[PDB]
């Protein structure tokens, strides 16, 4: 099969924000929140 391993190892031209923050937040999921009890 046509290999793409040489084409695979590239790099994207990185360029900095004006404001930092929100870095390590890529893959996180907390539990769903409940509703209040009804009466």
């Amino acid at each position: 099969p046509t290999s793409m391993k040489a084409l695979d190892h590239t790099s994207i031209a990185s360029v900095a924000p004006l404001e930092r923050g929100s870095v390590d937040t890529d893959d996180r999921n907390s539990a769903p929140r409940r509703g209040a009890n009804f009466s």
Binding site: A13, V15, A16, L18
Partner: protein, 48 residues
Amino acid sequence: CNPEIWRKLTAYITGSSNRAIKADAVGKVPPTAILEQLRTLAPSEHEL
């Protein structure tokens, strides 16, 4: 006030240092590439 920079990054984005370019043999270079070499030729610490 520096004449070398405006020659080096026209040599890069035209492909020819000394000889003229014809009107038909005109290629294309994306602005990300010229930014990545402008970072090396004229250095600063502010991307803006």
